[PDB]
Every structure is written in C-alpha cells, then in structure tokens.
Amino acid sequence: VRYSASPALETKCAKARGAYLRTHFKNSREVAFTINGMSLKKAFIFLDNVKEHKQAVPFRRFNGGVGRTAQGKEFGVTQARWPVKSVKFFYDLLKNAEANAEAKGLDMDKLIIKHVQVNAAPKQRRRTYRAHGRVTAYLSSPSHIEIIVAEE
Amino acid sequence: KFEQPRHGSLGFLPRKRASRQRGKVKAFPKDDASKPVHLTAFLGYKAGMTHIVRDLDRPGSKMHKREILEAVTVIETPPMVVVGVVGYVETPRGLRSLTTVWAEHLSEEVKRRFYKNWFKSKKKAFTKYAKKYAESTQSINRELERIKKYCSVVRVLAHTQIRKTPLAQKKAHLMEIQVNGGSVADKVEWAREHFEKTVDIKSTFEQNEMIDVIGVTRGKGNEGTTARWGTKRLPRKTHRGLRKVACIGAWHPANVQWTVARAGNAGYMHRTQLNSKIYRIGAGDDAKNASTDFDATEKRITPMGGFVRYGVVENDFVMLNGATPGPVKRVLTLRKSLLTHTSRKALEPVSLKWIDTASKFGHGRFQTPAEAKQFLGTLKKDVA
Amino acid sequence: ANLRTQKRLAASVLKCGKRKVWMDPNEISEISNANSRQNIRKLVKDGLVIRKPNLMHSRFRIRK
Amino acid sequence: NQVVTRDYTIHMHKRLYGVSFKKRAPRAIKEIVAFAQKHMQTKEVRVDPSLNKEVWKRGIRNVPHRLRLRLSRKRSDEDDKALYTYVQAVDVANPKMETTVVE
RNA sequence: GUAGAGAUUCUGACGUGCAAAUCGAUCUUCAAAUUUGGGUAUAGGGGCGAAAGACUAAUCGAACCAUCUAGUAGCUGGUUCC
RNA sequence: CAGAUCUUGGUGGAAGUAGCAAAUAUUCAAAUGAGAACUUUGAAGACUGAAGUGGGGAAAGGUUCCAUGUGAACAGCAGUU
Ligand SMILES: [Mg+2]
Ligand SMILES: [Mg+2]
Ligand SMILES: [Mg+2]
Ligand SMILES: [Mg+2]
Ligand SMILES: [Mg+2]
Ligand SMILES: [Mg+2]
Ligand SMILES: [Mg+2]
Ligand SMILES: [Mg+2]
Ligand SMILES: [Mg+2]
Ligand SMILES: [Mg+2]
Ligand SMILES: [Mg+2]
Ligand SMILES: [Mg+2]
Ligand SMILES: [Mg+2]
Ligand SMILES: [Mg+2]
Ligand SMILES: [Mg+2]
C-alpha cells in the first residue's frame, strides 16, 4: 500500500490507515479537515469533546441542509455537527498511529497530525421499496482513511 | 372586482425582528432656545396594567360629568443618573458626534453595560479615563469647551437605576437624552453640573402631559399570513391547508411582489406610539400612591399579590392611559411629544376617582389586605 | 446468560404459561446449566423456579 | 466527607407541568437523575427499583406532585475515585419538608 | 343491527404510497336470486356474461407464448477523418 | 462518432437532502459483554381482552423445528440477538 503523501521525515513519522470502513464518507471528510494540523494530544481532547457535544465538527463542503449551532462559532461557521460514528474510527486510527510512533521511539510530545485523507471506498448495495412496485438504490458510502503523524 | 383595502400597512416593513431591545428615539423635539434647559426623554420599566374610574370633564359629551372606566399602564420610573454628555455638529452629511465627556465616577450597574461577563472581567472600563479626571481637570474642561464652540445639539448620557427595581437584570440601560432649552453653553453647563446626579420623572414630565412611548413589541415567533397580515381563511375544503394566501401573484411580473403577504416573523418589532396621556406621576416615597381625593384609603400602586411577573413598585411611576408596546418588565422609552396639542381631549385636566388594586392573578375582589380581613372575619390559620 | 430455553421448559414442566414462570435472579448461574427437563424439575424442587400465583380477580363487588 | 446522605423533596409538579401524558413517568425518572446530578455533582446516578416503583405507582400519567428522596453519595466498586449517587424513596406522611442531612 | 359480504360520501388520508387500488370515518346488505373452501366443465373470433364491451392470471372493442419476421412504411430520428 | 427518448457498462449534481411519524408505552436494577434504548433475569407500568396479539388445523412453504456456537452479509437505527 502507498500513502498519498510523504510530508515528513520517514524516520520521525508514523502511519495508520483503515480501509473499507463502514462509516459515512462525507462526515469523515469533515472530521479529517478539522483535525488535520492539530497536535496529537489536542486532537484526542477535541474528539472526546465532540463525543460529549462540548465541541462540534464544522461541515464545510458537505453542508447541504446541515443545522446551525453556536458550537460552529470557534471555526467561524454556522453549520456543524457531532458525527460520533466517524469520530470513533478516527479515534481508533489516531490511537494506532500513536502506538506506531511509540514503537519507533518518537518524542510523544511534539507529534502533530501532518496528513489525513478520506477516500470514498466501493459502495455497498441494499434495496428500498418504492410506491407502485418500484425498487431504488439504498447504498452505503464507506471510507478509506489514512493518517500520518510527525514531530513538530 | 369586489374591491377591498389591502391587508396591513406597507409602512411597517420589513417585519423582521428589531435590531434592538431598548427602544430608540428616532427624532427628538425641535429645540427652542427661549425655554429653560430640560430633558426630552426618560427610560422606564413596564410593571403592568390596571384600570381607573374618573369623572369625565368634556362639555358637549353624553358622558360629561359622568364616571368612566379606563385601562391604564403603570411604568416604573426611578430617577436616572446623568453620567456624560455628547455634542453633535451640524454637517452637510448630517449630525456628527464631535466628542463625548464622561463623569469622573460611574456606578457598577452602568459599567456592566460595557461587558458581556462583568463578573469574570477585570472591571477595567473607565479606570484610565477616571485617572485623567483627577490629574489636572483640564482635558475635561477643554472637551466641554469644544462642545460649546461647535455642537449645535447636546445630549446627556443617562442610565437607569435598575437595581432599585425587582428585575433580575443588573446591567443598567443607558441612552442619549437630548437637552432642549436655552443656548448650547447652558446645555453644557447644565450637563456638567448633573454629572453623577439623579434626574427624576417629575422634573421631566408633568400631570396631564401628552407623551409618546417607544418600545419593542412582544415577540410572537413566526406566523402565517392569516394572523401575520389578517388574510381571509381559505375554505374548509382546501387541499394543502387554508391559513395562507391563495394567489401570491400574476404571470408577469414573473416574480413574487414585495406587497404580497407571506408567512414570517410577527412580533418583536420597534414601534413609537403617540399621544399617551399621563394620568398620574406617582411618588415612591409616599404611602398613598394609589389614593385619590375620593378614595382616601392609604394604598400604594401594587395590586394584591404584586404585579404579575413583575413584583412591587416601590419607586416613582407614571400611569399612562391605555396600552404601550411590549411585555411586562421591558424597558420603555418615554419621549416628549413632537406635536402641539390644543384639543379638548388632550388639554383636559385629569383627576382620578379610584385606582383598582385588586389581584390581577385572578378574579380578585379585595383592594387591600385590611378589606380582605374585614370581609372574611377570621380563618383557621388566623386564630392560630 | 440466556435463559430463554429454561423459561420455555419450566413453563412446560410447571404446566403454566411462560408469564407465570419465576426464575431466581440470584441463581442465574445454576439455572443456566439445566438444559434438561429433568434438570428443570430439580430447579422446581429446590425452589429456584416456581409458578407464580394467578393474578387477582375478586368477585366481592360483583356478589355485593 | 465525600460520602454523604441527605433527604430532599423534589417538586415534580412544576417539572412535568405541560408534558405529554405518555411521557410523564419516564420524564420524572430523567428529572430525578438530573436533580441528583445537580445536588451531588455526580455524573453516575443509580435509581433504586423501589423508587422506580414509587414514581410509577399511579401509572404513566399521574406522577406525585412531590416526592421525598434520599440521595446517598457513595464510592463505586471500580477505582475508588469514582463517586455516584444512589437515589431511594422515603416514606413520609407529608413530603413538604426541608432538606435534612441523614447521619 | 353484530360476524360475514359490499363500497355511497368526505370528491378525507395517501398520491416517487404501508399498497401498480391501500388507510380512516361514513355508508349498503346481513337468513337468502345469501356468503364461501375443495373437486369438476367451458379456451381465443373461442369461452363466459342478472349486459359494463364486462370478465377470461396487474393483459381484453379479441389473452398469453414461439414462429412466419430483420413483416411494410410516400412517415420521424440518426448516419463516424482532413 | 457528440448526438440516433441510440446499446451495454460505469459514474455524477440533486444530498448527508426527501425521509426512516398508522396499529396507546414504556421505566428501574442486575447479569453477560470490548461495546447494551433493542440480549437474558427480576421488578414495575401497560396492551391484545375468548368474532384474541390465545390454543389448533386445511391449502401453500420445506427444515424455517431443536441444541450448541457465530455475528462478515441481511434484520432500511442497533445487535452480545
Ligand atoms: Mg462535490
Ligand atoms: Mg428539511
Ligand atoms: Mg418504501
Ligand atoms: Mg379536495
Ligand atoms: Mg390576570
Ligand atoms: Mg380524495
Ligand atoms: Mg433494417
Ligand atoms: Mg419491425
Ligand atoms: Mg459517445
Ligand atoms: Mg452528427
Ligand atoms: Mg442517451
Ligand atoms: Mg431529514
Ligand atoms: Mg382497546
Ligand atoms: Mg384491555
Ligand atoms: Mg401455536
């Protein structure tokens, strides 16, 4: 497997990825865009706060119809949400990257999220039944997620 | 065909939420230099409504020398404190504020107006300005002198003593009150002398005076065209609802016109209501606030059980006839009239015969605690 | 533990509805090991499984 | 010091004042938990099943206007740095009482 | 008037439906020219019809399947580099 | 080959939108578990109310029955079932 980027010293970075993860691609993109560039420890704090509805993930691109909240203010937006299912996958991937960095002996105090990317995985297909005996798609939009953390 | 007037006034547009709560004086009365120096506006708090009985003095009327019952609105008006002065220069682009001069000391309630969290702040609001006042007392006098030389319009900065009301809000309301009267120099001198001083309601307005009331109306949320604009209810048979307008426009203009009724915000709007008559300027220091020359019973202007959702009115008050914008406890701006009044209705002296002080929390039948005790005798709790 | 089977077997052994079977909540471990109608019968003899009484329906007011 | 037990009267009537009838008893349970969370500052609140019985004694719509409650703040069986409140009912003749500390 | 059998009105709900005909209320009939299971007979210019051109497997002023058949079209659409 | 409401396949914007609201209704504690609004046990509150949401059959299905396990897919939310 190849990560989409190498924006760090190979010897001073760690990697984690997840493939075919059954969580919404659009929500995951918004989470990734928000935690990218954060320090690893603060990313964990922010993700836990989103779980508690103390902070929110701003929805910037896939925002059609998203509701308004005073928790978007800190990011200068009005549309934000708390996609906890996507949060959990990122929390587990961040934990994996941390353990990978602990295995390479990096200084676990300057670790920064240097790269995070969500790609749309192959869709999984279900059916839904519509009026007048019709059948239409009921697809899932799983995601591929990769994370690179590095010393600042 | 089958004509009818349009629903609602195009003069009250857009029907958005007001951008303010306080109530803004859009136009002060024309200044007369021949009169003495006086204030043109005051801030109060809507305590509640009651009703009075008075003898009508209106020759030519069927109710002349007969008793009439009238609803009135009670506004609690403790004295305001003058804390500053603003001078305005007349320019070809309108009035412009030249400079603002503040009192040496400001109380806490007015300084809370400059903060969103006064408690968590360092309370550094006029601390450096205050030190300037007591260093040489020369930049203050220079700023005042510049208002005298320039500045055809002078307004004092005055704030309410909201802590004297039963309101939970501690942050005072602050407004510019134009000083009308003789000469710009006398306006500035009057203003400087009143720094940190109280101006009370009876020095601004008088009995029988016709004034205007400005406030923001009761919030209503959204409303459909039936209640927002008064459109006719569509028939019971109407598929997809009947509380709407049937046709919101023609072909060509291929656009919805701004004059068509639409669902939207129906309340919390800025309004200045004209010609409220002062029926009484009560005094907070006297125990016969609600007594008359015909009802000698010593009672104050608070119904039994207290004003609903307000409390006890212990300060000065005004007893305007009729209704005012806004709910109980909203701050209301009282303004001097821009009009001249010579009608018999406006000029008639008002002398109340009786002021109701029964409970407004129900069908209250006793004006005073003593009247209740006498009518009922003694109860199980009263004996022991 | 999943006592669905024992609840069904106890109803058969006690000759009552499943709604009348009481299984001791403090003896989950012992009850879950039964698996047999003979084992259920031992639970009934030991008081771990009982048949609850019929819901009250009194004729007093009706007779009055 | 941390371990403390007090008796409270909760004015349930004003907390259920406009509530859909099907939601009144379940809402009363949530209100009691929030009440204990506020008084004892414990995130974890446990309701005695006997107290659940008292709340539901008159069915889903007619919760008592007042309830006398015993809140006990105890140490959990997890790490002993976790405090939780256990809420029980108190049988009293008239629930119109003040908060009283239970020794 | 209930079960059962129907289907008048709301021109109600729904009308990318719970549903290619349903849901609610209302209404018709309710001991007979009654309702109905299973067995059995009638088959396409044929059947069957207390008759609406109805019904004959979501198909009816002539079913469905394959073939004749790449049916014919003075008509519509398209017709690929410099 | 740019077209034929062209053919077959793939994939978009609409969109994290429409929506997932009939059939009265759930709650507390415990156990199990990485994880419990949905599993199991106890307690409470309710419903079908014998022309039943009860107990059997005919037709039709065909192993769906039972026990022990599992929990990817499916059970339009969840899953230790
Ligand atoms: Mg896009
Ligand atoms: Mg919407
Ligand atoms: Mg559907
Ligand atoms: Mg209609
Ligand atoms: Mg009243
Ligand atoms: Mg219709
Ligand atoms: Mg050809
Ligand atoms: Mg052909
Ligand atoms: Mg092509
Ligand atoms: Mg072409
Ligand atoms: Mg095409
Ligand atoms: Mg939606
Ligand atoms: Mg019923
Ligand atoms: Mg019943
Ligand atoms: Mg059976």
Short mmCIF file of C-alpha atoms in Angstrom, two decimals, chain A:
data_model
loop_
_atom_site.label_atom_id
_atom_site.label_comp_id
_atom_site.label_asym_id
_atom_site.label_seq_id
_atom_site.Cartn_x
_atom_site.Cartn_y
_atom_site.Cartn_z
CA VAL A 1 0.00 0.00 0.00
CA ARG A 2 1.13 3.58 -0.68
CA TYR A 3 0.06 6.62 1.30
CA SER A 4 -0.92 9.63 -0.78
CA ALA A 5 1.82 11.80 0.72
CA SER A 6 5.19 11.87 2.47
CA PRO A 7 5.23 15.33 4.11
CA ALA A 8 7.62 14.39 6.92
CA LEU A 9 10.87 12.72 7.83
CA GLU A 10 10.47 8.99 7.28
CA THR A 11 12.40 8.31 10.49
CA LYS A 12 10.42 10.89 12.52
CA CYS A 13 6.86 9.97 11.50
CA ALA A 14 4.31 7.20 11.98
CA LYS A 15 1.37 6.00 9.90
CA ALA A 16 -2.02 4.39 10.32
CA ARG A 17 -4.80 3.57 7.89
CA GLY A 18 -8.18 1.90 7.68
CA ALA A 19 -9.85 0.53 4.56
CA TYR A 20 -13.47 -0.25 3.68
CA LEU A 21 -14.61 1.32 6.96
CA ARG A 22 -18.41 1.40 7.12
CA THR A 23 -18.80 4.99 8.20
CA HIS A 24 -20.09 7.86 6.09
CA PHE A 25 -17.56 9.31 3.67
CA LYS A 26 -18.96 12.87 3.77
CA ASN A 27 -18.96 13.05 7.57
CA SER A 28 -15.45 11.59 7.73
CA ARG A 29 -14.09 14.24 5.37
CA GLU A 30 -15.36 16.97 7.68
CA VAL A 31 -13.73 15.32 10.69
CA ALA A 32 -10.42 14.88 8.85
CA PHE A 33 -10.36 18.51 7.67
CA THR A 34 -10.84 19.73 11.24
CA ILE A 35 -8.19 17.60 12.99
CA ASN A 36 -5.56 17.98 10.25
CA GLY A 37 -2.65 20.04 11.53
CA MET A 38 -3.64 19.61 15.19
CA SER A 39 -1.29 18.34 17.83
CA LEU A 40 -1.99 14.70 18.58
CA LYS A 41 -2.90 15.29 22.23
CA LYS A 42 -5.25 18.14 21.39
CA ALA A 43 -6.85 16.08 18.64
CA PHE A 44 -7.74 13.46 21.25
CA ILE A 45 -9.19 16.17 23.51
CA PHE A 46 -11.24 17.67 20.68
CA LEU A 47 -12.54 14.28 19.54
CA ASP A 48 -13.63 13.44 23.09
CA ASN A 49 -15.35 16.83 23.34
CA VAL A 50 -17.26 16.13 20.12
CA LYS A 51 -18.38 12.86 21.69
CA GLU A 52 -19.72 14.84 24.67
CA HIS A 53 -21.34 17.54 22.50
CA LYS A 54 -18.96 20.08 24.03
CA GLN A 55 -17.37 20.90 20.67
CA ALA A 56 -18.57 20.30 17.13
CA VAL A 57 -17.19 19.37 13.72
CA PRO A 58 -17.83 22.19 11.20
CA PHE A 59 -19.36 20.84 7.99
CA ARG A 60 -17.77 22.99 5.28
CA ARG A 61 -18.13 21.10 1.98
CA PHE A 62 -20.94 18.58 2.54
CA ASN A 63 -23.15 21.08 4.33
CA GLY A 64 -26.41 21.00 2.35
CA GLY A 65 -29.18 21.23 4.92
CA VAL A 66 -26.93 20.85 7.98
CA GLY A 67 -28.38 22.59 11.04
CA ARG A 68 -26.94 25.60 12.86
CA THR A 69 -25.18 25.59 16.22
CA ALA A 70 -23.33 28.00 18.48
CA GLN A 71 -20.50 25.45 18.56
CA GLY A 72 -19.58 26.35 15.00
CA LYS A 73 -18.50 29.83 16.14
CA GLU A 74 -14.98 28.79 17.12
CA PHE A 75 -14.40 27.75 13.49
CA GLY A 76 -16.26 30.77 12.11
CA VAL A 77 -19.10 28.67 10.67
CA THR A 78 -22.75 28.22 11.46
CA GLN A 79 -23.18 24.61 10.28
CA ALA A 80 -21.59 21.96 12.47
CA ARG A 81 -22.47 18.52 13.75
CA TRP A 82 -21.26 15.74 16.05
CA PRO A 83 -20.68 12.68 13.82
CA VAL A 84 -19.73 10.33 16.64
CA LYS A 85 -19.52 7.19 14.48
CA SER A 86 -16.89 8.86 12.29
CA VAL A 87 -15.23 10.24 15.44
CA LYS A 88 -14.76 6.71 16.84
CA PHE A 89 -12.99 5.43 13.70
CA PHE A 90 -10.63 8.42 13.75
CA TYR A 91 -10.00 7.98 17.47
CA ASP A 92 -9.01 4.35 16.89
CA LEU A 93 -6.80 5.24 13.92
CA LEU A 94 -5.14 8.03 15.91
CA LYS A 95 -4.51 5.57 18.74
CA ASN A 96 -2.94 3.18 16.24
CA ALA A 97 -0.66 5.90 14.84
CA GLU A 98 0.33 6.84 18.40
CA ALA A 99 1.23 3.23 19.19
CA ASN A 100 3.15 3.05 15.91
CA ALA A 101 5.07 6.19 16.91
CA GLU A 102 5.73 4.76 20.38
CA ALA A 103 7.19 1.74 18.58
CA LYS A 104 9.58 3.97 16.61
CA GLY A 105 10.63 5.93 19.71
CA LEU A 106 9.48 9.35 18.55
CA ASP A 107 9.17 12.06 21.20
CA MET A 108 5.50 11.67 22.15
CA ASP A 109 5.18 15.36 22.97
CA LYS A 110 5.73 17.12 19.63
CA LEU A 111 3.60 14.79 17.48
CA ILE A 112 1.45 16.74 15.01
CA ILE A 113 -1.21 15.36 12.68
CA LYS A 114 0.60 16.12 9.43
CA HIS A 115 -1.65 14.34 6.93
CA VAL A 116 -5.16 12.93 6.99
CA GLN A 117 -7.19 11.94 3.96
CA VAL A 118 -10.53 10.23 3.37
CA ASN A 119 -11.21 8.44 0.10
CA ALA A 120 -14.57 7.02 -0.97
CA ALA A 121 -14.50 3.21 -0.75
CA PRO A 122 -16.58 0.94 -3.05
CA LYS A 123 -20.24 1.30 -2.20
CA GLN A 124 -22.21 -1.49 -0.55
CA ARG A 125 -25.62 -2.08 -2.08
CA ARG A 126 -29.03 -2.53 -0.48
CA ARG A 127 -32.54 -2.06 -1.87
CA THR A 128 -35.53 0.02 -0.84
CA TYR A 129 -39.13 -0.49 -1.95
CA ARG A 130 -40.97 2.42 -3.53
CA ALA A 131 -44.58 3.13 -4.44
CA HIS A 132 -46.17 1.47 -7.48
CA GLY A 133 -43.98 -1.59 -7.19
CA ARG A 134 -40.64 0.12 -7.83
CA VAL A 135 -37.22 -0.54 -6.34
CA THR A 136 -34.45 2.03 -5.92
CA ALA A 137 -30.94 2.11 -4.51
CA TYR A 138 -30.14 2.18 -0.78
CA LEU A 139 -26.34 2.36 -0.86
CA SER A 140 -23.73 2.84 1.84
CA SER A 141 -20.71 5.13 1.36
CA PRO A 142 -17.79 3.57 3.27
CA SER A 143 -14.42 5.26 3.55
CA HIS A 144 -10.69 4.67 3.30
CA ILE A 145 -8.81 6.69 5.94
CA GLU A 146 -5.06 7.28 6.24
CA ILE A 147 -3.25 9.33 8.88
CA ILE A 148 0.36 10.46 9.21
CA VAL A 149 1.59 11.97 12.48
CA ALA A 150 5.01 13.57 12.80
CA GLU A 151 7.23 15.51 15.18
CA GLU A 152 6.81 19.29 15.02
#
